[model samples]
Target: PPPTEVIQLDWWKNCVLYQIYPRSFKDSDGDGIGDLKGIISELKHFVDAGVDAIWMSPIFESPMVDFGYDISNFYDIHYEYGTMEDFEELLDKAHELGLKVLLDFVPNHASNESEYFIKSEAREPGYENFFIWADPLPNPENPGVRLPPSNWVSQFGGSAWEWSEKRQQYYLHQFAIQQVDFDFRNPAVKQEMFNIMKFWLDKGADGFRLDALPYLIEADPADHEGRYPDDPLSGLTQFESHQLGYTIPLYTKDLIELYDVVYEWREFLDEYNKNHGGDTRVVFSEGYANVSMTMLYYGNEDGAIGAHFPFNFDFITDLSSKSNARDFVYIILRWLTYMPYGGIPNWVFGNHDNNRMPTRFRHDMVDGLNIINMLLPGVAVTYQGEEIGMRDGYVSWEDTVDIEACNRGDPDTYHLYSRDPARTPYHWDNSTSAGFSTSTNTWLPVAEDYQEINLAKQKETARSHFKNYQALTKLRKQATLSHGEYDIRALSDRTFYLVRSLPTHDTYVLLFNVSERRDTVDLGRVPHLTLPATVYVSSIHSARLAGHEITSSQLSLEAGEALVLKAQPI
Candidate 1:
């Protein structure tokens, strides 16, 4: 291998995206909720750690019902989060330490409290036609009665339409009643949204994680009489968020034109970056769509609409206890095949919206999962508290601050519908407020065992999960791991192996034993790979630490162990 190769790479292509849920990240003024200054105060944390960028969840101005997701103003910062000047200061300070920042962009809906929606409710001229509104229709639950305009149900499990007495019309709200969907067909609406995009770019954000891409554009009806019919209900009560089994959202989401709107925004991002010396400005699409639906977000045969990539959540969404060696291999191949021709694959494990990775998978198996995520030949996103192995906070119904849980009204089912547990304040230490807030009265409860699990304590433990993540993150700095080509083979239902190759260096193989028993993986079954000569990293205590020899034809792993190693030249 040459000392240096002339290969060039884009920053986002292999960047480590560290996601921060602002509300639960840190609280600076003792407000019991995280804020910008809190994030700023901890800026040194990411600098010392090896993260390329911070993708902070929504910090836009809002009324706090759905946190920052339901935005009252796109241009202003939420008072609870911080002011514009505070955000500017944080942004500048972050860039000084070589960090890029991305924010949550909500284009599908706006808070009903927004001035535009307020005046629209008042029937004012420019505002009157801003939101999607319709006349009341006969209710299916009670045929004799009239209710919201459509049979569309909110994701929170109720009517998606809210009757506005002031306007005498029903406005569409896919989430909470306070969130009204915008009529994207209105050109004026597009320009206004475009202006907001420019405002942020001018303010120096590197990019955006565009929220709910599928929900942003809906397939419209030809006329008033062509209104949506009631969705057939499935009998499963398992999903508390939405009646997905019974109701199909075919008409409301993932419309073809959604790409057009997304592409328009992409154009703005490119022009901004190009005109200003071509720094990286990107749009990341967030959707619940499966592979087929997700692939379309990258654009069409003609060219891309502007989003750099759709998040690959196969590991998080599909792989679980039922998954085995073959399942992991199959998912990788399937997702790899479905991706757009040349787009770099960005993998995600845990996110702010779901349970932490270790809590989902076996705690002992977490290091293996961490290595798999980082060893991929692309970008890897890490949620805020995941580095320390934080679990859900387990807030009771009475103590829960989640609007979704409260709307459902069931203590037993609260965990199913409520995201409160996942959204709780970050437990930084053993202190009264877990060092998240100076005030004892936090907006959300920190988990019970914070003393042992917090970062401060984990730092003292030496071999903590945080150290494992930090190790994987450090190894990820190598070009072989970040820009490598990969292949996988299943040695058994419980054991599997992967080969990672880069033109500049030796080939590396990763062996896994997801099962609860020791196993030997015979790589000879797959004639394509070589034998291992060096143990790079491993979770097993039995594996060699000082460089040692092992053949790729034969490898052993303890129950719940994995190893990344370099293969001897064949």
Candidate 2:
């Protein structure tokens, strides 16, 4: 096996990732919004908190149609967030503290009002296909059919097209109608986007969290129904084609073509870093629809184009039982065993799009939940406030500020705000407004119970979840945990046993009790056993190993306690 260091990128693999949604992260101006200065103030805390890196959501100048994703100027920071100077300072501070910074890059689409789109509206000779535009079907039932040229559905709801009165054309938009999709097949488009990436890399930005990468290069204008055929345009066509309700599998052969684009981008990134003397830039793709299919794009040992690691979606939802967790582990392990040379597997339990982890698993045994997240395989990306065990709250229509809620026409659907609960501001202190801002109003309400659960209050308590997280992160950094191989030991009805970081000499056992009552396991048959294997950490209070027989005779786990034992083979 290759050295673990060679297998992973610096400051990425096996690292703890902290995600920040810029608009709600912190508000420095008291203008009811978060700005770069606010983030600067919070950066020291992030560094001190021991996170490997910070993944910031988009902060580019935008119309806010879909918040920062609707970029109006790809090269500039939004005035609402701060100036380019502020962003420079952020990069400087992050690197000064040994933390890497990953910024969001929304390449698939731009705000309709963007300069490129405005230019396209004038039918500028060379810019005709700069953005996707389709002609209306001849002899429509409705002569003035304003619906999208195709039957594609926008992720935001309705057709992915908006009739442009100025150009007498229908432009494609896979997200909001205000956000127009870019025609990446054009050489100028790729060059322009690469320039945008270079601008950031030149400014010391460490990496990018690429948004909707596959949608960059889209379908042929003639292929209305996205389907893979002998024709190049038939498979995984553009967002406009997808908006037309085409079901061409995105993970099919077309991905290899899409991956070529990523490979080219990576090549450019490598050249940029080599000249600048910085770490190799990393790319994390948001492939939410299909995990395995997206993983295929990362290529096999034969070489193909794709991200270093496609985001794992399994961790985003709840896995209630030990059986489920085991199954999930088996799937991941099997993939790793088969595709060792493929892209690394990255794990994320929550992001801005879903309910926070603690809130989602509130019904589970909290201790067990905590243990699993801390020890889970692969890089762990955690949302803000999760370290302190933050819980979700009920929000009313008046409290909902999510773009999805505001865009929905139906009152019932609008009222059921999809992201309101998780998008609330972070809890930093027990003070008013959770130290997010001094203003009387914020974009989202600070949870009322912030005083009790705030990081400021909990950091002082030894047994607090915040401390446990810090300890876990530090422990994971140890060579044993960071590069260890794992194997399932005892798989039975009452207990699930596994050993991590084995074969290189240092071995540790992770035992989880699936039963509610006291249970005993005889370890006489186990090889190379030693008495009294030290308990490095545990959710349970007591356990001991005597002679060749390791027993938990007096150990009683209260439902879901876990144990981490350090033992040597006899």
Candidate 3:
């Protein structure tokens, strides 16, 4: 039978978004960091592996304080990454490959050294209200003590307010002192930010994933209880102090008014989409919130639309040693119901800020996890190196480069605040630089196990993790799996059973024995499975399954094996 399913809305809902941190992806310049030309040169590897789209981390010109996160110039490329022409070439090449590209959009803040902030320092006319700045005041209780406006704390574990003698006022920065927050309260500032989006859209980029979107707007004195209030004591444990651990942050983040800003952006995006012939652009928000709160950004409650969907974070935070097949089933079920009436669903396996899939879970379970990532009926954003089972690389305090980790300058607290473990250069081969760079050294050292766990070793193996990733990517193209309705199936303690079916009657059954002991999934729970089955793909050795040979009543797999089957009715 052939697929008859039709897609009515956006193409993004049915695509897999692959994320790449260009600084660590691949290096063509051999300057020890990845660049646009490097990305363009290596694009074939991923596109051929079946990547639908690529979400690149920031590449805008920066002073390298927070790496590429602190942009000193939005319209130009960083010299280290490449020139403006390099970006255009990369963009042209990507479009040629039939792949869409999304660049990271930093809206909440900018580098203190940015042109606008520099101009705003003079309290000049056009740029005066561009950033969040306020006058320092004497402590009411102490009289002689001058202090920043409030007790708000920085995410880097210090006061969020910094005093400037020249401006004679305090500026708010959620991160390091170099990264200043923007005053979204000003209409001009909003227009300027929106113009930045238009600038990129005009340059041929497809969309953007707004960084720290929930923090884009903040509470002001006029809107609060007549004045800014000092935050209460921080109740978080000392270890968590580095990230939003201090104070209630009522005046700093997650303001209700942020929704208005998101909706406004959506209107502009929609206009741009229509102007460009639609389905050619999108906006994804990186708001760290629960399912309920994040769903609001979708604006499905009303006809007004906001972000397509906030990048889902629950997938990473919910995993635990005590988790099992039942836990995963319930999680998926809850997510299905949690999306707003007209919103879409998204999945995440790993990202630059956290543990790699293999390190977080069992190495042997990588295949099982990959099956879950691509087989599920939604957008699965896989971080770079995840497809080949890259583990978090080892980094020492002496070699650590993260600004937040070294801010306190404490060797004892490096690991607690250091993101270097997850930000290592891509391990591509068994060479001196792991084939990522020709330079003897990289910004961060490559993973030591690269010789055994790299693409060079698994590119052609039939049952390697790389092959499984490719197989899943190929299967994802099927209309039933790409735009299908999903249902959790009857299962055992160690087994996960899932069914993806289109209204066209095209169906697929996914089975995983995700446990230390062998288990059998009750395929009978899948109504369409009574139709004969063919094992389309497997994590173990390839199975030579014939059409209609296997039935719904089958299969005892190995302890960690995964099987994906296609079924058709008589």
Candidate 4:
């Protein structure tokens, strides 16, 4: 009998997801800050680049204490970004161009200035339990002193607990002092978040990228005299007193209780789809957890009830600038090995939380690394400025505004911990402000090399990183690259290869060299694989041209070169 079941395609699996940092993407008012109108003016850029979706970082109303992460209101747009009218137009323009829009959802915490936080501080009836609050413990060493209920440390620095003078209680904050954690055990808080999500989805948002997902829930000391257990000390001695690395954070991070919250959010999203008739709304979570815990975000074997996929951080956390071909293979296999049966693997090299890819990896390898990111069988997450091969700009201490660095160290040493360099304004052209704004100065200084590396130059060049990125994205539409079975192996200490093939489609092989020295490789040496392949895509620095045929079994690769070849089966 013929198969009755039909295969439904998911938009995100085949889509190239691009992350845009709202404040640095563009500036419409010339105030040196990126806004919703600035993003709307650039819709044609995403359409021309061949990407299917854009995920902008948080644009909600915030105090700017931790940028947009410390959101004060979930329903309103930040004044610095734009107004609600601008957001509606941005969404409409994006959808009009066949582009899906995903907003950053910060659910774990809210700014202390938020209405709920303020009312909770005042001990108002309905908001009393909105945030986690613990009574201060009397210091044993000093009779009149008060201490935190637990030894948990904030992600920015110092104690996670802050003393509230008005309420005479200590509130827990996992990040900056202004960012307070929510008490998810309170049913009212969960309902609040559910309502907020529905509000955005109803506003025509395609989906959300949940931020800081691992710390959604924590252990409660219900039986321990209202005092939580202290976290164990990490043995490493290189950390300062203000750093979170000094402790193991056993009670504050990656608790099992967080999974149920993820399940509930998934259920809510599914119900939204059932009621509304359209494409399935999707979600992907961000967490730096281990492989086992990451797979759980995909849900249990019974059915789908969690995130469609969790952002994979192996490339950012595991691989290094000096990692060789063999090291790359191990990091790639780690995620695929432990993923659930229905899971779709996603690759992320850089985001607002980490440094730019070019600065993290070598400049010469930008195109090579992007090739691996795009050609893989699942989602390809590209941080803004990655396509143009933008490196980190230089932001001096006097110009630094990052809370993570400002709170941790003095001016002289803040740059060591600051993320400002990676958050500099985008370069549109060769003007003094990198064509980002007409202001005398940008909110953050533009990179000095903008004249040479701006998009205008790349677009006019014969062969450049931007052109190579576009070619790869176009190749992504092929069935051989999108839904093919793959085999990967390190050919040598300096070189590696990946093969993607389907039953009726032509076989594609990628040969990559990680070292600085050039090498010639023979594909015939590998068992059951034959060659006389044609060059489908070549790196910006490749010696061979696309559409050129490689009649011989052996080929030459330049230093840090990567090539995609289309061949026949043995």
Clashes (backbone N, CA, C under 3 Å), per candidate, total 5, 13, 0, 0
lDDT of 3 by residue, 262-366 (tens): 999999988998888834699889877766668878885557688988887766778644567787787777767788775778888788877787787777678
**Candidate 1 lDDT by residue in tens digits, 333-362:** 776788888887887877866777767777
Task: Give model 3's TM-score versus the native structure.
Answer: 0.94
Give the alpha carbon lDDT tens digit for every residue of 218-257 in model 2: 5564454643122223344443343323444342223445
The per-residue C-alpha lDDT of model 4 at residue 555 equals: 70
Candidate models: Cα lDDT each? 0.79, 0.67, 0.80, 0.87
Please name the candidate that would achieve the greatest lDDT relative to the true structure: 4
Candidate 2 residues lying further than 4 Å off, grouped into runs, are 1-9, 140-147, 223-256, 317-328, 331-342, 363-370, 415-417, 489-495, 503-505, 512-531, 539-555
With candidate 1 superimposed using the best TM-score fit, by how many Å does residue 343's alpha carbon deviate from the native?
0.7
**Candidate 3 ranges with C-alpha deviation above 4 Å:** 1-9, 237-243, 503-505, 540-554
* Clashes, model 3: 0
lDDT of 2: 0.67
lDDT of 4 by residue, 261-335 (tens): 999999999999999968778889998888888888988766647898989998889876789889988888888
lDDT for model 3, please: 0.80
